[PDB]
Write a protein that binds this ligand. Structure first.
Ligand SMILES: [Mn+2]
Ligand SMILES: [Mn+2]
Ligand SMILES: [Mn+2]
Ligand SMILES: [Mn+2]
Ligand SMILES: [Mn+2]
Ligand SMILES: [Mn+2]
Ligand SMILES: [Mn+2]
Ligand SMILES: [Mn+2]
Ligand SMILES: [Mn+2]
Ligand SMILES: [Mn+2]
Lengths: 377, 377, 377, 377, 377
């Protein structure tokens, strides 16, 4: 059918040409809850609405502050590599956190004492590369498709510092001198960046491991997120990875959230910092409570970016018949939330009653245990 | 079918959950021209991706700098009124330009010498309300749906200054004193804004015309755009309304562009200022040339906002089988463009040849007459 | 009498209409020391010059960056609660530090592991609520009046996140779902914020203490400042509370300063950060030394806010016949000062002499012990 | 010899490694007047201290806000073309003003009604291209070397919009469609920008003049500055070109100043806007008086950029044995100055005397006629 | 001879008046490597191009953000004191790091617990004064000339807080009261700042050491940099002083680099922060690789400031026949670099080969040990 922006005796049929397919994806935007109110910034953007850079070996498309201006501190890239294909050795100012959605890949990273780390990363796995440290990605036999997040929203995928591009812009005599070789021994250096390129599949991980005079790195740069025990509640699971368990991940705290059909991520806020969200699969709606009686509801599905400014109240409700699976990202060294339910459960009942104009029948239902994901009764 | 981001030997199939319906709307973004290159800001946003404020009498939804950060100087509202329904008497800092897409409506405006203007506005008609001057909209028997543009991108639809809201926040004794009445004579004033409200259809326009001690206003605030003679070229028409013909419209210059199937708005730029675009109907693609070998192609359809930063090169190509109809908006007192074709036509042939590495066979085809819309041969 | 801005052979009688009562409160501004010089920003603002929000149960009035633009990092609220009256359960981005001037009150706070803290706070007592953690205030039998300070000067008292306002702007079905109740079981929720409301006096503190599965909080959120041993000098006392003794108070370091008639807070500066001041009682004058031979003298009394930009030199001299009692606030994890006297006492005498063009008779008087408050001989 | 920063009993010999050649070029910086005082921003930069872009056909090197941060509104390029060599047809946001120091060149410009202007420019000649209008430069038989100024200090020489670069980044099918040609008819378009390129000398100017349906342009874009009558004073000449005589030059007002050995540009200020300076030949010193008893003296010679913030007092003294020849540039529609001498000449003598503590013997020497350049007696 | 900006078939002879002496100092700027490309900010400024403040006892000249706008976080002063001459007791917001190039000097510093530190500093020695703590410099028998660096680029040498200036702007009655003396006992205080003043040589360091009730300071404020063991590589030495060895130096990490004729500081970047450079002696060239195929080469010699924005690639090549000696400064608590050579040495050879299109003959030459300075073979 054809949705109309009508709610009871409010609204009207659309009369100008329109985008029906988008209206259908945004039922809570075309027809908001009556409890929404006031101007709130846009907190929703689709990777489908971005230009896709296509290379031999895959593609990369980004959502930045230039697309979603609210998110000044965090930007993201959806990257894809075909089997064996290489993301060129490179570096950047920003720290890089990543979630492997499809496939498997090998990463390399050398730190500032010249200690190397090389490791294979599967679906549900993370990596974190501290600011400025050089790294690579090479997909294995299935290829790889993954979400990268960078701790500056000004990030630009096109402006990474790359091995070949650096050498292509360094005088040949300096390069020769740096390495102790002749200009002729290096005449075949690429004249421009590679960025992403087809390459033969590598061998087994163990034959790549590079021994060095400098030691093993003190903390791993990868993390098996889905191998951890999750917080289980009635309608879903939550896997948390931050600087307290994923030790190198100093500037990025993360959670993977699974919400079953008919369940929701409960009403909570984050007392530490802004939340950046990516919707891996499923269909959701969320309301951002902005104080001063301002609130606005957004709809999300696979490939959408969401955002919740520091301390604003929210929930994320699965509104489809498949599991809702999304990531919660924070630029901080820990994950923290305050749950509406737990908060009220931990105060005197008559006090809460004074506040809400409700009785024992309500405060009796409060739970002092925190359940990040609840099921509808 | 299912589009893939593959172009020849570049790109790959998508392997993560995705938004197929959006991919289908963005063929030139999922699969960009090979001539696209480098980071360019987002220049595309859909009104379907915005929260819709529903009231008794219609609705309003906005696209601002909070949604499309590139457009710092211009914001827009898509507003809808049911028959007789009123947009409350109000005012704002920003100047207001409007295009009536569907229906008809009556506007009132009183200027700063207390001269009133009241007029009925049909499809294809414009209005312009200078900054700070108070105004209203009331839809006639068909209702009305129209596009408003404001000469500040920070504009917020919720923060207009409204008659009732002003009085609701003024001490009752001051109101009584201002008017020479008793507090009791005014006890029935609304306690909160109305914004949009159902009201009975008005009578004929001539019975509303208010006589005054102060004179007729010197220039009308409305304009019959589609009654003007358009620039006719081979594949379309262009109606221009700016401060030189629509005299009050000092801060906003506009063009309505119709592009036939298989035609395009030619390659041009604007030498004066940024272009803000609204796509009324049809399907388009445009490439923004950003200098330094940067360029990026965007797709648009009904309900989309587009933007072209000051002086960047572009074209707008109809890529559907219906007419493409869009508006070109500029915050300036005139419309100006420089056409690639005309520009080269007006230089010596051997000079142009020196530049493009092409011969008489090319420069022979150049036209010294400007044709804003061309047909494919 | 009638003060005139005349100092010896400088200045003149005022000849236009004037505000004599303010002139009398500002003797050192109408007639500055001859040693003052150059443009210095305003460092003085009165809570009496602010709009007072009146509610059933008390009032709140604020001094922010919108009032005192120099203070970009710190803002303050003077709040008042009648007996039993409640400051609605709420939260904010900013950390909250407070001094209880009059009365007593009960506070609640739940942290992010769902551990609650509930405690009664008397005159001379502090609290500190870390950013984002939810809290309440309820006055006991005497009522309560207290000074709140927030670690962002952009703070706005009207924009706190409140329990009822959040629920009033959340869809009723989501609320029902979050809690496992029916929409009817919650139909009585308030439709708008409460903010401050009359309520019956609570019972004894011990009957409120809420047991929980999560533990006692690791550090208390309140502090008995006046029960600490103060630094006693000849003309006054100084009580310091910062993150080293009041452990939770990470972002705010404080001092209460009592200065006897004829005494002054000595010449010092703060080597770490800006000083924000509140004048609880008494009458003072202070000179801010801004480098480059810039200096300006301000007058303060009860209800005034003062400020000293990072590292500028100053003193605070009691100029009335009652004790001067003011607070020194710093956005930092420690209190630090450098005393002019101690500094010079700790250098070679002939060196100091070389600097000041004075002899043994002066350097003999220097004290290597720090005396924050000195008496006139 | 070896200069030392010593002035009477102030200063000392330099004892660390140093740059003697620069010290010799900056006598008034290594050893400032005793009347200089306080922090003043840098107002001096050499084109010799910039990277020179070398192309086949010439070079271009720039001084921008990235080099001289004080000059936020104006930037400059020193460009050089070999005989016949072409500056690629291009455009920019900024308006372009130019002075032809060496050689001669042909310019083309097409305006926004498609009217072309083509003209030959000799030494002492100017051009002005309004923002956004496309243009070219081709040097004649002597080659050409000239100074360009742009009315935004953020200008970047590398980011101009160029004919070939635009086409290289436009889909071939769109180009074909725009022009009514086949993709094959245009397969030879350059793949990258040209920027500057060797080309055969053009023919006589009259064979290039392009006839058009649109008319002659209403005002010429070039100006014979040195053919105007200059203001002659005792020690030099001043040629003024601004929007009142060079009519198109709306955003840039200019003066060429010649100062004979032993003469100086008098003490004056500009009451309208900042002054940007280029030193064509000779050696100068200037003192910028910044108010609040701040002042600082700078040295300049050929290839130096200078700047004087809006309304600051100055003079420019030739300190070499050759003529001093420099340009005064203003982002404004007129040239204006206030002369210290004329100003005082036009007030009552006893008033001026009261001010300066001097007698008839001084005020008798004042001249009510303005003499921009004075000779030492 | 006379250098020309010609490189093979690119460039041309200069034809306008020019600054030949500067051209000679900038061979790589007048004639850049062909591998340079694109707009890069200025990273080069000479102290010779600054106004020199001359006082009785020495001089001070500064390079700030007002001179070198790229360096927003770090500014520097070149200061000179004659024998016995004093830098007035003073303080500032900024932390101060210093390198003693010529001579020897005594420093005093009193901390915020009133603990004093007094020490003599020779050539190759450092000091660090934490923000806000008061200090002095007095040169010994050879005089002293040294480089100061401040951890804010907005720093202004003229705006330090000075002992005498503070007292000159404090009411005499307050001063008398602060110290317990009479106004007459202090009538001889200086009326204005001293800043730098001639004074008799002090006595032996041990007779100055001031005993105090408060303890020895926990960490020294000076450091014997050249007495540490340096990193020795084939063509030079590197001495590192940061917060891990020079313990108080929390906000500034430093390295002294000596590069022999025919050697270079290798290709590396800093993964933590921007690099600020001072060239003590010798002649260098450096290329800054800015990503996106942007790079630009600068020339430096004694008295030059250089800068490398966070994470950009570079090398510093001695291009003269004397040792090149420069300082690397970072606003951070540690020194870190990533070496191109070590980085590649620590990855699989076939991987590096895949990247660079080179064979075993190249990867065989890589060194897993880091050699900051390499010699040409
Ligand atoms: Mn990366
Ligand atoms: Mn959340
Ligand atoms: Mn309006
Ligand atoms: Mn256009
Ligand atoms: Mn609070
Ligand atoms: Mn203080
Ligand atoms: Mn140009
Ligand atoms: Mn001037
Ligand atoms: Mn210092
Ligand atoms: Mn380095």
């Amino acid at each position: 059918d054809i949705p109309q922006p009508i709610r009871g005796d409010k609204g009207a049929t659309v009369k100008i040409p329109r985008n029906i397919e988008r209206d259908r994806q945004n039922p809570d935007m075309l027809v908001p809850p009556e409890t929404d109110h006031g101007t709130v910034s846009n907190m929703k953007f689709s990777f489908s609405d971005t230009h896709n850079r296509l290379e031999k070996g895959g593609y990369a498309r980004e959502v930045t502050v230039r697309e979603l201006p609210i998110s000044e501190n965090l930007a993201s890239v959806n990257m894809r590599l075909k089997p064996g294909a290489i993301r060129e050795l490179h570096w950047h100012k920003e720290a890089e956190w990543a979630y492997m959605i499809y496939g498997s890949a090998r990463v390399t990273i050398v730190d500032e004492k010249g200690r190397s780390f090389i490791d294979d990363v599967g679906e549900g796995d993370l990596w974190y590369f501290p600011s400025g440290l050089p790294h690579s990605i090479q997909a294995l036999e299935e290829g790889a498709e993954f979400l990268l997040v960078f701790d500056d929203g000004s990030f630009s995928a096109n402006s990474t510092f790359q091995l070949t591009d650096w050498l292509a812009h360094t005088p040949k005599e300096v390069i020769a001198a740096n390495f102790g070789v002749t200009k002729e021994e290096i005449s075949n250096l690429p004249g421009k960046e590679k960025y992403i390129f087809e390459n033969q599949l590598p061998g087994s991980l163990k034959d790549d491991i590079v021994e060095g005079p400098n030691g093993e790195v003190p903390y791993p740069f990868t993390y098996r997120l889905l191998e951890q025990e999750p917080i289980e509640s009635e309608g879903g699971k939550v896997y948390i990875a931050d600087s307290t368990n994923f030790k190198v991940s100093k500037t990025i705290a993360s959670a993977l959230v699974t919400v079953e059909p008919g369940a929701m991520r409960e009403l909570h806020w984050h007392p530490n910092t802004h939340e950046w969200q990516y919707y891996i699969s499923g269909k959701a709606r969320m309301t951002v409570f902005a104080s001063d009686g301002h609130a606005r509801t957004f709809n999300y599905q696979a490939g959408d970016v969401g955002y919740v400014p520091f301390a604003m109240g929210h929930y994320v409700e699965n509104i489809g018949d498949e599991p809702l699976v999304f990531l919660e990202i924070f630029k901080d060294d820990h994950y923290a939330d305050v749950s509406l339910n737990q908060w009220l459960a931990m105060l005197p009942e008559t006090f809460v009653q004074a506040h809400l104009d409700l009785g024992k029948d309500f405060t009796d239902v409060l739970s002092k245990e925190k359940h990040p994901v609840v099921k509808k009764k």
